[PDB]
Design a protein around this ligand. Sequence first.
Ligand SMILES: *[C@@H]1O[C@H](CO)[C@@H](O)[C@H](O)[C@H]1NC(C)=O
Ligand SMILES: *[C@@H]1O[C@H](CO)[C@@H](O)[C@H](O)[C@H]1NC(C)=O
Ligand SMILES: *[C@@H]1O[C@H](CO)[C@@H](O)[C@H](O)[C@H]1NC(C)=O
Ligand SMILES: *[C@@H]1O[C@H](CO)[C@@H](O)[C@H](O)[C@H]1NC(C)=O
Ligand SMILES: *[C@@H]1O[C@H](CO)[C@@H](O)[C@H](O)[C@H]1NC(C)=O
Ligand SMILES: [Ca+2]
Ligand SMILES: [Ca+2]
Ligand SMILES: [Ca+2]
Lengths: 388, 323, 475, 98
Amino acid sequence: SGKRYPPGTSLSRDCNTCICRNSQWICSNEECPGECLVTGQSHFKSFDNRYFTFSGICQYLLARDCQDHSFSIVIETVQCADDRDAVCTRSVTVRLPGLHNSLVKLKHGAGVAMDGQDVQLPLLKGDLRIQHTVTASVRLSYGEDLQMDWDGRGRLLVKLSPVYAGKTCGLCGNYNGNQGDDFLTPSGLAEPRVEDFGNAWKLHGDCQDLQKQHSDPCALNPRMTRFSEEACAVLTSPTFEACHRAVSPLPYLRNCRYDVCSCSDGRECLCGALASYAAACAGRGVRVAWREPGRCELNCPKGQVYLQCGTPCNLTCRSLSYPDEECNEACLEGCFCPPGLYMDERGDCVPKAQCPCYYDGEIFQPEDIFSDHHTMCYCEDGFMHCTM
Amino acid sequence: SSTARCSLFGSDFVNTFDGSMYSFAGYCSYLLAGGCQKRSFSIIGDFQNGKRVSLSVYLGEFFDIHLFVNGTVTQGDQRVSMPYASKGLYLETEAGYYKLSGEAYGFVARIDGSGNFQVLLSDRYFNKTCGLCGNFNIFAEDDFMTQEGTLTSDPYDFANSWALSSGEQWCERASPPSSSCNISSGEMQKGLWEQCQLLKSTSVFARCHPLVDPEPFVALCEKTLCECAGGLECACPALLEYARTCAQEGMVLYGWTDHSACSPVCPAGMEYRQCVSPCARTCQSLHINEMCQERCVDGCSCPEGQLLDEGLCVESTECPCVH
Amino acid sequence: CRPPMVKLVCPADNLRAEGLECTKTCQNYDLECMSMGCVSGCLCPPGMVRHENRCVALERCPCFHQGKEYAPGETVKIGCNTCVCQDRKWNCTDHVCDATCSTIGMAHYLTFDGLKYLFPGECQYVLVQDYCGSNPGTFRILVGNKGCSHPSVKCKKRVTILVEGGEIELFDGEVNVKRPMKDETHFEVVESGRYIILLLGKALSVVWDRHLSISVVLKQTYQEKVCGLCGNFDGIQNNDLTSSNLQVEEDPVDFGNSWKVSSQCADTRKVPLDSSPATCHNNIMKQTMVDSSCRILTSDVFQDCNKLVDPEPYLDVCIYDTCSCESIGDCACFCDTIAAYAHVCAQHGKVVTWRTATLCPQSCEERNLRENGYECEWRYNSCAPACQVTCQHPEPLACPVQCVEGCHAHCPPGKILDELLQTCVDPEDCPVCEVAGRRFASGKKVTLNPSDPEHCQICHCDVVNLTCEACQEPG
Amino acid sequence: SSCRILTSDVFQDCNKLVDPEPYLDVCIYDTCSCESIGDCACFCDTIAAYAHVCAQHGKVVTWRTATLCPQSCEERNLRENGYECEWRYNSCAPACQV
Ligand SMILES: *[C@@H]1O[C@H](CO)[C@@H](O)[C@H](O)[C@H]1NC(C)=O
Ligand SMILES: *[C@@H]1O[C@H](CO)[C@@H](O)[C@H](O)[C@H]1NC(C)=O
Ligand SMILES: *[C@@H]1O[C@H](CO)[C@@H](O)[C@H](O)[C@H]1NC(C)=O
Ligand SMILES: *[C@@H]1O[C@H](CO)[C@@H](O)[C@H](O)[C@H]1NC(C)=O
Ligand SMILES: *[C@@H]1O[C@H](CO)[C@@H](O)[C@H](O)[C@H]1NC(C)=O
Ligand SMILES: [Ca+2]
Ligand SMILES: [Ca+2]
Ligand SMILES: [Ca+2]
């Protein structure tokens, strides 16, 4: 990447390692986890890093375990503004044939509902551990060979471990490290147009087929063009100059322009489109500081403070009740509160003294004493250090 | 035919291309007319608080002109002079009314003294236009197509689906204004009812009826007449529109303003001549007949003498030389 | 309901009732359908699936491709692959066709596996080479441009083909054999139409449009043995940016600099990404005009090809080139970037005619007028069989491109053309010779059978003379 | 440099009669202001004007090569069932004929 490295160094491509010998890099060749991304108005990134756009209105098959049937992820899209080029995802549905053939559904309000009933997170069922996130998201996690991400506003990350390489069919592609064959339909024949490839994956026959996929929605609302341009030029500004060599910013720039000109509220879409590139850069390792008072400083309640690189392991009160549980999680860009303060059930974080206990679901009180005739427990400061 | 005439007259009132009068008091820029599949141009009409403020034309997405009711006309971001002639758009004061013609694109917009708008789209845009003036098909019943492509029945939803926010407009769904008339009616209405009924009773207006039905006009003037603060003129807008549309149908009605007691506003010196020649008689003008024979248009011009000199009537003897 | 049709009722003792909500049409059949109840309307009999308002008795229903229905048994050709669909899916063949580099325009490249990248260099570079890793290798095509970072009326590129130990570099619209090829039977230059097709082997070829359009056609043989500015031709498209030091790169410019031949030359400096490259920058009017002008790639005559080949890469190339390029008398930086797309279309069988008198005229009458009388055998033809039999190549040739564009001489049968005399003349009035009585060549100046001198009755021809020299014995 | 074609080898004879300076200034002005993409006509026309003026003075000029304003004429023959080939470009052939 245009910089010298003394012999013996060991670079990493975030999944493999390279060693500099005799002016040549010897690099390992292991398969790596894949990420299918649904973001913005109608922007897709396949498992093999194929960026495209597809503004269809139906229920589409995003990604299915395609030889054995351990899962299936289906997405549903609706017009998301006044225009005809702003088509965003509303809700996402997951089928778990390995679990009672149950049907989880992440809703538009960032809620979740298994088989009709709503569900209060966390949910540590047999395999899947649905729970909220620092940024009020929803993180589904089936087994350890699958993950997923919230679907409130219409963004979604699916992470598949290399045990699924080459054995998944959907809008996300084969997941075989080859970008070329990602426009593959069920009939096993790549179609060179995104409209046909998208339409080949819709679940309902009454949905309208897409005919033309427009590239410049700015041309139906000229009043926006100029703003969009400058509003997205930040992606090439020195503010993001750090991570231009980790992920190229061209697709995110096109997505930013499309989102700003098309969607109803340009203010929200500009910062929903810059945050996508920031997260993409943060994936590879580069942490970018891009928020400004003008540029969408996220604001959470007055008790909490914005942290760029936090520690989502010990903030919640529940954590103190299960300290043996392990948190192999990196730092997450959100808001937290000082280490003398832990998150309260209501939401206003308090010092660990008045912090309830979550023994078998049921929440106890900071000095509640639950004795018995054979055991005894009392909630001291977030865990009942309790005798038998 | 070969032309159609949208018109945003009165206060909040709109008359679509096919004659679907309604009332809408917006808050941001809207889409008057323009093709909806291929968008070569797009006339945009701006509001501030119910009351309109300007007219705009966005050629493609590279050029834009903002002709403001306050005479001011900016291009892009900078105030320009008048007349203006760039990019194939000719912007000039004709018959005392600011005019913005684009005959290359087949459209002519106009603003009169009081602030009314008037758009004359061409015939090539038949069944092709898509805006706040409804599609230009002969039918007048399906003119409320929202931007989603679905016909509605509430004018405010139709109009709000066409809002065009910008970098510094960011507009929101608009709602009808609360009515204050319902408590204030009575003694004034006794005489007020005649101002609207003369639209169809009066003989000079009585020959338009085979061309245009006058029921919607009297309806709209009647509903806007109540909030008037004791004045006859508060019904003459509709009459004016009734004249203009009747004129656009090919039968111009002459001298309706003799006893209407309401007259259009015009710059001092000039009187509202019904069917004045669009071909003026400025002091510095070459006498080229048979080359200035366009269609007559209603508007106001100087008296019988008093040739024009930069928008100021002066006697023919005092034409100033220029060097 | 309808008498061919039939209704059902939702059982109140289940949840996966799967009624009218989850209708199973053709394309829905393979897909997996998740519902939240049932509608209890009428659904097709459970042996047949609704398709275009019917119920197709046994399913076996059509096979959609490019939005078109194909009755079973029908086959479609994609490249070298025939595809017929049985039940509902196509079981194509597994042939792998010839790959193809390209210098699309003045600064873009299109690798073997298919990948458009931008790299505006000014040094020499290794377009494709076989001396690549463990492989011994043969050929080393290099491409070198001149003043090309701001490509307007400059950047006359020059190729240097170092195959078989013979430099065959080509420049100024004229192939220049610097050193003879050791085994010259492979070498064969076929100047046809507007192109200078070069045949440098049984599985390697070069076609050059005489100005900038350079593209190397490789066959099945190579198949992940090459590397250079055109990637490694393996079918995987992601890894085509592996630099010369075996490290895959994220930026094309770093890749390109790593593939430079002379280390003491000037690296290309990264430029911040901008939609309007050089002159379209602040002149938004010009950018709009350029956009509309390049929109011809999506025009009524290009509709057929747009379904087969994606026009977006070539649209981007057109915009970039004719923004950076300043065209004064030569409107070539615009017409070439469309001729490239037309050439690709023709290679896919979709011949397109797009040149009109007011749009890239392309005269061809200067060849006829040279004769003292106008005999009129030269004429333009959108795309005509390029690699045809003349007096210089009397025998047929396996040849990479189907048809090409340019002044192709049409003239009455039995009067085959010769290249030296621009006229076409009867077969006799050519230096063609039949030494072995067969229609071989212009009496090929080629050594025959040295390693078995028992048959060495060596015989050549110069004009028509059936000449026969000797085989000088070693002892 | 491009407009400098007016003082070139084929135009040497004409310049002895008609001064190319007005036409040179016109060529420079037009080509600078003009934005040429697909039709290099705002240059070929300003040169064809000078060629016409030279021709009317008795100096017929041929300046139009395959890489400079080609101006093909095959479209007036191909429309026929057989390519008749009777039209051709002439730098200056008599205008009002019979
Ligand atoms: C015209 O209106 C604009 C925008 O409200 C205002 O800035 C300007 O002062 C006005 N000019 C005149 C001459 O009234
Ligand atoms: C206008 O176009 C619409 C939609 O294609 C069509 O339904 C209608 O018949 C057309 N009307 C006229 C007057 O051509
Ligand atoms: C491919 O086609 C051949 C020949 O018809 C057939 O024998 C074979 O079963 C097919 N295989 C697949 C995977 O469809
Ligand atoms: C082009 O040449 C081909 C091959 O000679 C011939 O079949 C065809 O008719 C020609 N087409 C035109 C338009 O001249
Ligand atoms: C043009 O017409 C003239 C007059 O007949 C003829 O002499 C000439 O050969 C034609 N073409 C040229 C190049 O002079
Ligand atoms: Ca793939
Ligand atoms: Ca209508
Ligand atoms: Ca590769």
